[PDB]
Amino acid sequence: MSAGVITGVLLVFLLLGYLVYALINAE
Amino acid sequence: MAAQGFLLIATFLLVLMVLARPLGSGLARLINDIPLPGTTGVERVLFRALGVSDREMNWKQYLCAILGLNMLGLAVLFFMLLGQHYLPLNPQQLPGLSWDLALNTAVSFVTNTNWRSYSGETTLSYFSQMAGLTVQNFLSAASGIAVIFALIRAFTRQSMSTLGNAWVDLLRITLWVLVPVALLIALFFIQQGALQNFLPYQAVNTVEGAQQLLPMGPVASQEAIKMLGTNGGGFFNANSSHPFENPTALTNFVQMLAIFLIPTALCFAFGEVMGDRRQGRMLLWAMSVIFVICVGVVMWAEVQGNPHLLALGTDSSINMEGKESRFGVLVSSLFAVVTTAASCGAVIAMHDSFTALGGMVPMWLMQIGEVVFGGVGSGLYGMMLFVLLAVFIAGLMIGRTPEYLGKKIDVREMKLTALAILVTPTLVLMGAALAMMTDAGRSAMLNPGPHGFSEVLYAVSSAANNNGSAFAGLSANSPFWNCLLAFCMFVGRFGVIIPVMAIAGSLVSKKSQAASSGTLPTHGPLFVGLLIGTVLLVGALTFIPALALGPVAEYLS
Amino acid sequence: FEPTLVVQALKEAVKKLNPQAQWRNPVMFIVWIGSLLTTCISIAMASGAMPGNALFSAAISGWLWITVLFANFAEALAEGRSKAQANSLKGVKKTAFARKLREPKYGAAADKVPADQLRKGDIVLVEAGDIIPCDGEVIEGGASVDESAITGESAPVIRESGGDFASVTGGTRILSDWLVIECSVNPGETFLDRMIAMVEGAQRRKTPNEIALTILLIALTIVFLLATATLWPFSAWGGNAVSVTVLVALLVCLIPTTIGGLLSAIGVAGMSRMLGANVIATSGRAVEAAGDVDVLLLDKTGTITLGNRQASEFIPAQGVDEKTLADAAQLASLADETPEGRSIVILAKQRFNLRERDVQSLHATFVPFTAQSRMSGINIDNRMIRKGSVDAIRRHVEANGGHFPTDVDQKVDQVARQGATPLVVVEGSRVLGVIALKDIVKGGIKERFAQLRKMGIKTVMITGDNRLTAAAIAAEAGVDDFLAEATPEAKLALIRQYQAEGRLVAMTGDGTNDAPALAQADVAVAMNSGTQAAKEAGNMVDLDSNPTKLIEVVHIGKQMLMTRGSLTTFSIANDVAKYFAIIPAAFAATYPQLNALNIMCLHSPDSAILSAVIFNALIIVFLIPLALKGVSYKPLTASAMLRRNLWIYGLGGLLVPFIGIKVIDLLLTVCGLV
Amino acid sequence: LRPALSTFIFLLLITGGVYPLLTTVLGQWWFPWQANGSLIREGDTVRGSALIGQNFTGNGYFHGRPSATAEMPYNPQASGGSNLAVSNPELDKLIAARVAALRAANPDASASVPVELVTASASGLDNNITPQAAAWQIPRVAKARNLSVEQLTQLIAKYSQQPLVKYIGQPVVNIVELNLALDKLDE
């Protein structure tokens, strides 16, 4: 896997968990 | 064509409503704990013999009973497929399935999906089909109707904390709804030519020198459940096109009714339990309007068919490529919409060999969430998730608190419905993106171009939504596709039942209130369209790009 | 509200709201992340990297910061009008010293002590000229103070010891004499700090309706994150992958940046209008609940009329000067703190400049207004001055051996024809004149109840008058029904019976007299009480003590609910045109046959994405005045308003992005920028 | 946990034991021929069934749609279809190959080939063709067996079944029964 692509995949996963955590709470 | 295509839709819906109306009354009794006429004394003798005490269960207890039966189901099925060589009723000496094939197919039938990464006559024995696949076609269907029973009770019951008894429902559903009706349906199949025996494989010496080996087995019994329980798993590699499983056009019309039988009756039942039949009819009204439009598009798309046929000097451009001759183009087109809107998965005609539009509507009706007549319980509470969403946005734009059936929806209930809605679209987009980045996923395709990506998009969309339909051009017997899809099927099923039960337990503790100034009619045409727009726009904003790179590109190509 | 003075003082703070301090807003945090990498790439892309075109990504990334800047401009603009009003009252209390007496008796030795060091139980002296340092009760002395700091009215009000008028508010200014008070509130709980707590942030959580749509906005950004991030592996197989700068621009567009940057500004702007109506709420949750009310109840027991009718004219009958009328009418109305009484004190200063009165030189005893007597007055001279309605005074004038003059009766009958309830002022046993109390509402007050009637909200008046006289006031106001001779148990029966029929109830009344009723009510506004009585019950406080102020409370909460509902429908409806602008453009290099879907006939794929990003940023500025001023909705039922909200904001949300993308794209073509 | 395992084991014995045995016993009782595959036998050898579908290549026999199974055409051990799309280029070559080959084998018939005889079936074991497509190959069968065109059409219409309603399906000819009847007629 390309270095630039694998970092973009890690960015999507961190933003997904950040949004799912935000939906559960009221911030 | 247009006139016959119209009569095929009218005759199908008219006969459907005639059969589903009284069945909705019987389902209303099971929701209201009222036993069936003949099933009054036998229940008492049987429930005590089995240890079922008719006790009331809360939502946490009701959920752990359903999940307990399902986790026990795949544990038994997965080991049946590994030790298939040792169990009897095996005329051929078929060996035990591999770990990836056994895990995928075990998860498949417990999920009610019935994915087929194998060839029936080559892969499975009579015992594994009868003591493993038929047994799970009942339990997965019963588990689906059990969940919707609890949710419906959460709307009619007031200020309580119990949702009934799951073990009483799972018994009443199988013993006096699934088994007796499927027994009649399977017997009618046998008369028209279906297969039902335990004979060894028959050798045939044709009139020419060629010799062929016939596959036998108890097919007719399994055929009735997969259609009535919306399982869609065929005894053979070609499930509904096989002459042994669907011999005549008459049995095919029966098979199409069985797909829509229970999921339609659950709307008549929900309207009767709630007292106001209009609340059940609008739900039935919004589904049939989307259903009729979808069948008209695929019919027109398949009648146009492939123009290269006409350019090469054939009789017409009709796309008979992935079709059967017993059933017309309109019938194969209608069945294609029925089996994908209702999450059945029964393939009468290879959807991979459809046209650009004719194959996109089945693709789209799965991604939409199996809401339009979604087969066996799952489709009803799936729509209810959008009903709560439609009611929520309705009051949100007016400036009042949401209120469905008098009960006011709170913030905690809206977090669970939102997450439940996001379950299936998350698994398809992540699942498809994983396949389009692995060599084991892309190499499994068959056709090139945008249709090749449509093969991957259709596979994960069907697995996550539990439909089970496939293009079949994709060869998914590899351990990658077996593990990838099994994850989408497992999470796509129980990941939605769990928040639905939490929605159920949250609604019983509330008391329905009378109509105020801020209430909104959840019946009539205004809410039907608001519900249709809610289900269409959510699926659109989610899959419009992936469809543009799929069948839409093939259409404009 | 929008002066170049404040805008410049905010745009500087707007550019200061750009660092990594927006992670609490998930929509704008994604827009910030997208703007960060697109500039981080375009800088490295221009210096030395494989991509060939850098000015395009610099234009995309440029507008992405402009999108974040415009979102901060809305939040700062809403907080700019609020913090300005908070600082206007914040300086009022820090100008003060404080002299605390060693001995509670007046005349002791006092030393100057910082005002913030005053605690509960201290005894401070305040003579004329100084401002009240802290709240509490008056224990010695009597003077007229100016409570303009809390109500905005320069009209005087008396504060004397040993009575119902011993409640003084810190921050106000005394005018006439000296006052010795005992502090009763701790620092941080002063009446001025509660106004600060209502305006400043960090103490106002999200309301249920605010939490409502945020769950949908996070669910939508989850969809649009998965819908676009999976386009890269989907498109890299059919051809060359979609560039990251395009995926970011596509995601920032689809993400509801319209309301995600305007949602926090609507709440801040609404709470400011709440303070503008002299209503104090502990949190924004109460104001939102007033908009979800099906029936509001107005308690008229503690006052003459509903509070809409206020003093209009001074009319002297025979041989009385108008100056001597308002001179005594104010003295009688000083003890009448009801809206009817306050307006007479207001008209005393507007026509004759009666601002201050030396209370000690009068050697007077004030008669407060009571509902049983239906009159207030003062015993300043050896004669007693009184002021009340027509019925209650004739029983009092004839009690002093006085007769009703024929001219006075003719004047009272004439004012009754106009529709204004006439009040009379009498010195001892001789009538001085009549005071007219006409309606203040610009339009017909019956229309405000009619507008509330069109929406389905019912109005019921609560009072203790007779069944025949209560219907007269109910008919002149145009309310639905009324409850006359209401015992504190009859009020609870009306509230509980409404709740038993599934209807949210709002009620305005006195904190002491209607203590059990306000607790059972779903929404409550307290009159004639301090913040301490309502802060425990979580209710609002009406500073003007006007029963009709509940109508404005419901309207302010309604606008806060309509703007959120109208913008979500408008913002989501934009996504149809936004897909027809990016789908054929972003995939033109991978599947060129998708150019047929470009319905708007946009010039070039790079110009299509630029026009969508520019519209995704310019639509925020165009909707800032709508989000802060409020939506001017029309009175309709539930289902009828659902249709009208779909017609204006659904079609408007459909056609505006179509026209908006074209004009932005045509301007890029005419100017020849890209 | 006692009602959990008991409900599971009871339904496992009813649906996996009682339900299949009841359908099988009642099936072999009322409809024994159909339940055993509805086989067609002459003597002790199994020539086929009315639902199998056979790969007919002889010049004297009627031909069915292309099979597209795994190993050999019309293999009941595969039961598959051609999952080729319209956008697939290999399908066009397969269509042109079948159109040219059928026109060569049927020279005294119309040049327009019925779409059934050029498109594969979904199951791969299709034993059915519309009555018009069976008449399209009449001259080839008539020349190879010296039978008249009149009695050949009368033989096809005899072994043709129409659905109960016209829009439930299409009229269908039994190929295996038509070819077997053609052999007894030739003698």
Ligand SMILES: CCCCCCCCO[C@@H]1O[C@H](CO)[C@@H](O)[C@H](O)[C@H]1O
């Ligand atoms: C994804 C996990 C969802 C958890 C949400 C559960 C919502 C349950 O809801 C609550 O359950 C309690 C009993 O358990 C009841 O007492 C409460 O009345 C009910 O509101």
Ligand SMILES: CCCCCCCCO[C@@H]1O[C@H](CO)[C@@H](O)[C@H](O)[C@H]1O
């Ligand atoms: C790091 C340097 C990036 C420079 C990018 C600036 C992009 C400005 O873009 C221009 O802004 C004007 C408004 O100011 C608009 O009128 C023009 O239409 C627009 O092209």
Ligand SMILES: [K+]
């Ligand atoms: K299924």
